[PDB]
Amino acid sequence: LNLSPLERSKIEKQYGGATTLAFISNKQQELAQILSRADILKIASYDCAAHALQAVLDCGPMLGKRGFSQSDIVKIAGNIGGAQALQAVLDLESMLGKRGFSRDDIAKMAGNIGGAQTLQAVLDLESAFRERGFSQADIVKIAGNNGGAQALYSVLDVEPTLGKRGFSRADIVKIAGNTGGAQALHTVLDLEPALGKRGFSRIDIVKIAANNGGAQALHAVLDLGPTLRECGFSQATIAKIAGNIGGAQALQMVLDLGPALGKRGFSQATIAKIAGNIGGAQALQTVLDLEPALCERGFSQATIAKMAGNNGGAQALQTVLDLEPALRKRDFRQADIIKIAGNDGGAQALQAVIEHGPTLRQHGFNLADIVKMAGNIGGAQALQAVLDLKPVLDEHGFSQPDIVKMAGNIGGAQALQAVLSLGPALRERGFSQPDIVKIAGNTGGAQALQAVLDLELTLVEHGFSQPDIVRITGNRGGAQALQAVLALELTLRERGFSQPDIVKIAGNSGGAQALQAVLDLELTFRERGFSQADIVKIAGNDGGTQALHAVLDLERMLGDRGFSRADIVNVAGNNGGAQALKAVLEHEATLNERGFSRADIVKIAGNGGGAQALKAVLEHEATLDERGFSRADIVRIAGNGGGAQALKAVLEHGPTLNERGFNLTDIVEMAANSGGAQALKAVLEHGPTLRQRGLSLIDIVEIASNGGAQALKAVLKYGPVLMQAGRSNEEIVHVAARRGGAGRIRKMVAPLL
DNA sequence: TTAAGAGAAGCAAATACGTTATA
DNA sequence: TATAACGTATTTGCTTCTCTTAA
């Protein structure tokens, strides 16, 4: 084996690694019979691998046949004391088997440090976790971390005393199910009293403690807690910082760095938002050390605080400091850069962009696509998976946008494999190809495709159908919703609900939480009393359960400020309704002062984004009066989805469009639609060209308000071509000035291109 | 050599909020 | 109008590396 002198040193730098490097290049051929070159080098990357490699050749073959996988074998031998843990499978892989333990089960105990004497700790307290309430499953999760024998021997010791102290058995498990959990428990048993007497909830104590190094986080609260409060930090905010891996390091780093960041501009809420992830301590230190080099490249400190405000943000800030020059010397705009690094693992997505970006444009993909596939958590995996799978997907008959669809969401790497693995089978069930692309086309897409295959048969008989199985999953509800439909549609079919009802409530992101939410709330709603249609209206949108709970919490106060039932439902019955309902109560005061009636607030709030639109009607209503717009006009412009954006647009492009010849009434008609901000934008930049081509002012206004930005961009691209082919201006305008005008125009060109 | 523990980075999935385009 | 279809934020939950301390 020709080891690159990099590969060598990575073996030699281990405690005993000199002895190992001899051993591998002595018994090459033996080892070659069980291990790949990768497997070897991975085993040899741990302290004393000489003895671990010898333990693969003694116990490995005699474990291929005891029911273990070679992938499992490596994960156990490759580790500190990995030779003891492998010895301790051929020692007791049976006394555990004789007690109903899987192979993945035994593998999961041995595949961390200390694995050997944890296996024999399970062997002894399978009977004391038994007559204790604890399941066999429990035992494994606790023991699936480094040295979980400490965790086991200690759960048995703290459970009695804090079983009777407001802690679930599945809180005890959350705490001990982490490397260094013995510490975690023993630190709780001595600190939850002092923490209750400081206003910290029981749930909070759980979260603070249920990470690696939970014990350090727990003292750090009793140490820096009070001192953090007298800086401007909530007990809510404090427990969010400490609720992560290295909370003790994030807290301490806030103190050390906060007042220095709080003078560089960084608001205390921004700072915490950065300190509130894993490695929050690292981000903080990195932000303060890369502000200027970044302040001098076009990065606003709100933009800087985004890149820092995720997992491994410290690594994001640096990979951008170094590679913004390169990617800007490529064709990437600052906002694209921030998308590809403003995610967890952004440093990786970035490097992956350079590493595959050119090779991808060659494959067919423009840069809007590459930013879409990289602008996700795990975008590095996403781009790499698109390469390796590209020829395959083409064979299976998938469009290029159909690739960027599946690849464009989180876990897109996974989604692509799933449509190769599953999918050829899914046709046999009777699903369409675009039906399949919908299933794979959202987050958790790989997961959904499996769920469909597992469940669709039992579902169709249960009184549902494939078309509204596609509906439930293409609409983001996913695997979770399909499992929840299955297990709940019976309780739901005794409480009075219909199938298109159950379909509607499932057919949204979060729809599994909603199905259960209705079940828990439907009575109290009916008690108040809203009808079933109301419950379904409120529930059947993204974030359903939030909306259902907010109504119940606020229906009183709203009815105390002039608003009717049918008002509350209309404000609740869109995405963000929970948000829309809190904003009504908070901005209803000054909106009555500024000339807006009750039914108007409902008009402004009774769409998705109602919280934005109400706030936006609080900002611009002064300076829209002094431009000439009536109150009634401000209500039309805001009273659509995206209302907030269309009021910013009427401000921003309003004047520049006046010169061009558009009257204020015109501006209103173009802005008073879903997408109005874009209709104005498009008229702004494409209006003058269309005027040079022979189109009326009135023509442009007719298209922009029927119509829309899309229909204008289409007249723009193909108008000339339709003319050359003998179409008239009057034709092209009548056809584009309606709903789906864009598509109508592009169906009119097509026989030409 | 083997354990124990602590911190950080990255990946995937689920859920929540918002904006646009389409009859 | 209601909804399809995106675009992103926020939240949970791992697995995997690296690193230190300790015996």
For A158, how many CA atoms within 13 A lie in the half-sphere containing its CB?
A: 27
Q: Which of A195, A131, A144, A204 is nearest to A173 (CA)?
A: A144
- C1' of B5 to CA of A184 (Å): 10
Query: Quick check: A83 and A54 in contact, CB under 8 A?
Result: yes
CA of A235 to C1' of C17 (A): 32
Find the Å distance, CA of residue A563 to C1' of nucleotide B17.
23
Is the Cβ–Cβ distance between A147 and A113 less than 8 Å? yes
Q: What is the DSSP letter of A180?
A: S
Residues 6+ apart with CB under 8 A from A334: A298, A299, A328
Domain hosting A627: range is 1-753
Residues 250-289 on chain A lying near strand C, CB distance under 7 A: 278
C1’ B8 / CA A745, Å: 54
A475 CA to C5 C1' in angstroms comes to: 9
CB atoms within 10 A of CB A524: 12
Q: Is the CB of A309 less than 7 A from some atom of nucleic acid strand B?
A: no
A:561-580 Cβ neighbours of strand B under 7 Å: 575-580
Q: Is the CB of A674 under 7 A from strand C?
A: yes
Chain C footprint positions (protein CB, under 7 Å): 1-11, 13-18
Residue nearest to nucleotide B6 (CA to C1'): A213
Q: Position of tokens 């990470």? A: A211
**Alpha carbon distances (Å) from A388 to A363, A392, A416, A447:** 12, 8, 10, 21
- Closest residue to B21 measured CA to C1′: A675
- The Cα–Cα gap between A524 and A541 comes to 20
How many Cα atoms sit within 13 Å of A177 on the Cβ side? 15
Nearest to A213 by CA among A247, A162, A170: A247
Separation of A238 CA and B2 C1' (Å): 38
Residue of A316, A336, A339 lying closest to A328 (CA atoms): A336
Resolution in A: 2.7
State the SS3 of A610-663.
HHHHHHHHHHCCCCCHHHCCCHHHHHHHHCCCCHHHHHHHHHHHHHHHHHHCCC
- How far is the C-alpha of A76 from the C-alpha of A111, rounded, in Å? 4
Question: In chain A, count of helices (H) and strands (E)?
Answer: 51, 0
Report the distance separating Cα A636 and Cα A672, nearest Å: 6
Residue with tokens 């930013």: A371
CB A480 within 8 A of CB A507: no
Identify the residue whose Cα has the smallest distance to the C1' of C14. Answer: A178
Q: Which nucleotide is nearest to A87 (CA to C1')?
A: B2
User: What is the amino acid identity at position A53?
Assistant: L
Query: Is A507 strand, coil or helix?
Result: coil
Residues ≥6 apart with Cβ < 8 Å to A413:
A378, A381, A382, A384, A385, A407
Q: Nearest-CA residue to the C1' of B13?
A: A444
The candidate with the shortest Cα–Cα distance to A690, out of A662, A715, A711, is A715
- The distance from CA A287 to its chain's CA centroid, rounded to whole angstroms, is 24
Tell if A603 CB is < 7 Å from nucleic strand C.
no
Q: How far is the CA of A184 from the C1' of B11 (A)?
A: 26
> Cβ distance A654 to A634 under 8 Å?
no
Q: Do A150 and A182 form a contact (C-beta atoms < 8 A)?
A: yes
User: Residue A566 CA to C18 C1' — how many Å?
Assistant: 58
Specify the residue for token string 């390091």.
A249
Work out if A639's Cβ lies within 7 angstroms of strand B.
no
Method: X-ray
Torsion angle of C-alpha atoms A297, A299, A300, A306, degrees rounded to 10: -160
Decide: CB of A342 under 7 A of nucleic strand C: yes
Measured CA to CA, the distance from residue A117 to residue A301 in angstroms comes to: 51
Residues 41-100 of A with CB under 7 A from strand C: 42, 45, 75
Q: Is the CB of A409 under 7 A from strand B?
A: no
CA separation for the pair A478, A251 (Å, rounded): 37
* Ramachandran assignment for A463, one of left (phi > 0), alpha (psi -120 to 50 degrees), beta (any other): left
Chain A 353-382 contacts with nucleic strand C (CB below 7 A):
372, 375, 377
Q: Which residue is nearest to nucleotide B17 (CA to C1')?
A: A576
Query: Nucleotides on strand B with an atom closer than 7 A to protein CB?
Result: 1-23
A443 touches strand C (CB under 7 A): yes
Q: Which of A14, A16, A41 is nearest to A28 (CA)?
A: A41
Where helices occur in A296-409 by DSSP H, the ranges are 301-308, 313-329, 334-341, 346-361, 367-374, 379-396, 400-407
A144 CB less than 7 Å from any atom of strand C: yes
The spacing between the Cα labelled CA in A444 and the C1' in B15, in angstroms, equals 12
Q: Reduced to 3 states, what is the DSSP secondary structure of residue A377?
A: coil
Residues A200, A172 contacting (CB under 8 angstroms): no
CB A601 within 8 A of CB A591: yes
**Number of folded domains that form chain A:** 1
Cβ of A246 less than 7 A from strand B:
yes
Amino acid whose CA is nearest the C1' of B1 = A48
Our measurement of CA A397 to C1' C5, in angstroms, reads 22
Q: How far apart are CA A399 and CA A268, in angstroms?
A: 47
Tell me the three state secondary structure of residue A718: helix
Q: What CA–CA distance (Å, rounded) separates A154 from A185?
A: 8
Task: Round to whole Å and give the CA distance between A167 and A159.
Answer: 9
